[PDB]
Amino acid sequence: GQKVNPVGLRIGVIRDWESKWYAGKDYADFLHEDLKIREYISKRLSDASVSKVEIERAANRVNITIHTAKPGMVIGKGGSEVEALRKALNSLTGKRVHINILEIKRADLDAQLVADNIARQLENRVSFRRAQKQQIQRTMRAGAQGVKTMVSGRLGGADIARSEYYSEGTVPLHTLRADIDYATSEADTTYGKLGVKVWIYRGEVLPTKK
RNA sequence: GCGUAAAGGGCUCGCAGGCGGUUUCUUAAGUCUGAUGUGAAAGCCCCCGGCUCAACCGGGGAGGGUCAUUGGAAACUGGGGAACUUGAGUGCAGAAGAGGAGAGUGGAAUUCCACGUGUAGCGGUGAAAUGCGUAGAGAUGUGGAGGAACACCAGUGGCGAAGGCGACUCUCUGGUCUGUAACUGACGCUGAGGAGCGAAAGCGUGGGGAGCGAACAGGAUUAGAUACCCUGGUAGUCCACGCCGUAAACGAUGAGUGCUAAGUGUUAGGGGGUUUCCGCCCCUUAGUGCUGCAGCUAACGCAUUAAGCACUCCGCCUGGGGAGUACGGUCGCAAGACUGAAACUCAAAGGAAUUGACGGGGGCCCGCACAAGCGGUGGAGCAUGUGGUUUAAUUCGAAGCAACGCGAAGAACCUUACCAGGUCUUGACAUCCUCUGACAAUCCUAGAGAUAGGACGUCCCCUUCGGGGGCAGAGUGACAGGUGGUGCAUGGUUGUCGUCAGCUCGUGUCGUGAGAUGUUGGGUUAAGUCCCGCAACGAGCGCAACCCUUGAUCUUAGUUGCCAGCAUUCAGUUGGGCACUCUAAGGUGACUGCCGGUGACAAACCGGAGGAAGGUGGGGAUGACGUCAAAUCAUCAUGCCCCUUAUGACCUGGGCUACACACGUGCUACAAUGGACAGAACAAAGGGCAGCGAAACCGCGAGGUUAAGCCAAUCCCACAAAUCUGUUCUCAGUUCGGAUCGCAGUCUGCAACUCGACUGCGUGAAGCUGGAAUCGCUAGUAAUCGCGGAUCAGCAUGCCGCGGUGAAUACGU
């Protein structure tokens, strides 16, 4: 029985360590600090869809370089909400963290925003074939080597085993030098927690040196 | 409609009946048409009118007959007469056969008998036994008797209506086909009843009984053997005379006739092309076998021997069970045969084809699977988990591998859910409304404690008063809670099948379809790996590689690490040095690269050099769609149900550790390759600031004291142990082994009695290599000797890594 973290399988060999920091006589305040800031943007992203939240430890000041799909949706009205939740995070963890911003375009190349946004886009009464084919057409048509999205579990109520992993194109699932983006989310409708998991293997980088 | 679904009669001969070659004259009996009669009304239909329309009524029509009487046509069926010849028959000449009936004869072989020869077994089987044999068997030699069947020719050969028919000869007899073509002139085809034949089993009588052989006897195999097997053995098989009249009586296909692609056999003939011959070849019949066009079909398949295409006639079929049963008849000596229902009940039986599964079916292959060796387990004491029994509770979860040294990477209290007791009910944790306050702390008492009372105590960062702001308290319900139930509501996650090599799709084609094809065939690999053919062409996940580690180096770079080359000591320790070792970055290096071949050239495969390393170098990470409603609501989250002044919350003590018993995985032993000591030598890896702890002294001892140093390639943990050199134990429950249990200490903690370990003295169970059975293992492997670490105050015989000693075997499927 196998299944593997694609996002942890390729991490550190071709993928990047999403949490950077020095370490450290006290790794505990770093670990819980990064989890708590990950839930800080996690709570502050009910409608922004920040597809990654990198925080950097910088000698008594965090550099929480929060990425975002749309810039001004979390970037505030020209500096209002970003300074507000930023300073509020400064009095939320204890370190005055000058949180930067990021503009993630190409939503078919963003894993958690496109898949999780497909899931909440399914939570509004959207069907399994309509949600999966619709995400395969928007993000599946957006440009990538292959995106395969499936919403596995409760959908339709009874006889709960439902695995429609509808997705096409090539997939470096076992190609260890592929560097695919593959993260899932969890939608919680009225029938039950019937979440979705999809990855979009955009393309590998050829190894070289000089 | 009838080859396989229900349905071809077992087969023939025939009366009645049903159907019938071509020409020609008549006939109207059918066939068809015209005229009259009659088929009443009401009704159906068409066309109008009347009740406001409609239903309805009325009027006007139509249509309805093997209908009569009667007039025509003569094409077709028929009546009658004349004809003709291929149909069918006779003739003439050929050919052929296990066609039949009766009689006679012949061998090969078995049994039995008589006698010679000879000894101790013969026989049978999977292995044996029953049985036979010293009373002379088997075998072998000779001779005799009797029955039954005829080997070789012999063959999807021949003949027959079918069942069937085989040594050879004779009598009597039927039939088939060929050939011209003398005659006859449709004299034919089918045919319900009726008649007749019909394997083998049976049935009656009388013969015959050599082999075979139900029932029966014995022995074997099995838990059982009224069976399979073996040794015997009655009826029967054989004959003649009579009855039986069933079969998968099969080609599961009734008979007759006409037509419709082809090839290739094979008998029985004929004509012929040259051929004395012979022989080849064509044409031709008749019969029979294969391969196939059209066509048929549900598919398999049939296909000039149709299941095609049409005609004649007979028989059979109307879902399955009930049930070919009952009842009634006919026949039978019987056994039974023919004929042959029903009540109830069910929505399926059934035919073909596909996908998968199965197989104690076959084929090919692989893997510690088996074989080959090593070392174990199951035997002993102990450690842990499970079952069970107990309990107030022995918390919940896992139950074939995949449950059992599992969650547990740590149970004295906490853990903890479970028990007993004392408590509180917006509550231990959170948001919200109001409301006061900065909150709280610090001691005392009572209590084992949670708590309850005091005294001591607290009494803001920002406005210009309204504040803002957490904190705490209260009300106050919205709420909060559940390690409750549902892993068959779930997400997430994880095992195994398994690193085994598969698992699918787009397009195309086939096939009415499901499906298939690719993916199969040929090799080759560990591989659906690669190559080549292929009605397929492509791609996806898998395989591989990419990643890390591991043995070879280069280059960079030398500090705490390394010390050659110099001085230096107890000490790389210290001026010195960066050669070597080592450290982590970039690379390089191995990819069938190269050579000899093998091989359908290709794929791969055998062998060799060279190199540190050779045919995926060694190892790790990586686990395909799917299976198991497999594991988890108790890591977490989550649909529903249920509890809530208690299934919630707080505290003390207990339990999770109990114990007639069975297991599961490991430890330590049973011992001389050993046991005790003395001395010496060899590692690698990781951790260490809430920490490691040097040296010094103290204590046998476990450890205590203080304290340099180390935020660590420097210092500490640290000394490795198995191993080597001497003393000695000497075969025994012991100078082996070690529990149990007692006294006596240390360390950890709020506290070691349930329940931490270690040490001292004493004690010295059981064990002398462990049953049926079962396990892991392909070389730095098994096995074995030690070290470090996660949990963690303490708590390892587990778990995860680390190094040391260093094997045997793989014949083969």
Containing A181, the helix (H) or strand (E) segment is strand A181-184
Give the position of tokens 């019937």. Answer: A194
A152, closest nucleotide (Cα–C1'): B491
Give the position of tokens 């799909």. Answer: A69
Q: Are A101 and A68 in contact, with CB atoms under 8 Å apart? A: yes
A 10 A CB-CB count for A135 gives 29
Return contacts of A187-191, CB within 8 angstroms, 24+ apart: A187/A119, A187/A120, A187/A122, A187/A123, A187/A151, A188/A123, A189/A122, A189/A123, A189/A155, A191/A154, A191/A155, A191/A156, A191/A157
Resolution in A: 3.8
Residue type, A149: T
> Which of A148, A72, A164, A65 lies closest to A108 in space, CA to CA?
A148
Containing A136, the helix (H) or strand (E) segment is helix A128-138
A26, closest nucleotide (Cα–C1'): B689
Residue type, A164: E
Sign (positive/negative) of CA torsion A17, A21, A25, A27? negative
A57-84 per-residue burial string, b: 16 or more CB within 10 A, e: under 16? beeeebebbbbbbbeeebbbeeeebbee
Whole-number Å distance between alpha carbons of A207 and A140:
27
- Residue A127 CA distance to nucleotide B151 C1' (Å): 85
A159, closest nucleotide (Cα–C1'): B489
Residue type, A175: T
Rounded to 5°, angle at Cα A31 from A11 and A180: 15
Give the position of tokens 């000041």. Answer: A61
Burial of A50 (0-12, 13-18, 19+ CB in 10 A): buried
Nucleotides of B under 7 A from a protein CB: 489-498, 539-548, 586-587, 621-627, 629-630, 637-639, 689-690, 711
Give the three-class secondary structure for A60.
coil
Whole-number Å distance between alpha carbons of A183 and A178:
15
Helices and strands: H and E segment counts in chain A: 6, 6
CB < 7 A contacts with chain B (nucleic strand): A 1-4, 9, 13, 25, 152-154, 157-161, 163, 165, 169-178, 184, 186, 188, 190-195, 197, 207-210
A190, closest nucleotide (Cα–C1'): B639
Q: Are A51 and A112 in contact, with CB atoms under 8 Å apart? A: yes
Give, in order, the Cα–Cα distances in Å from A101 to each of A57, A61, A72, A81: 16, 16, 9, 12
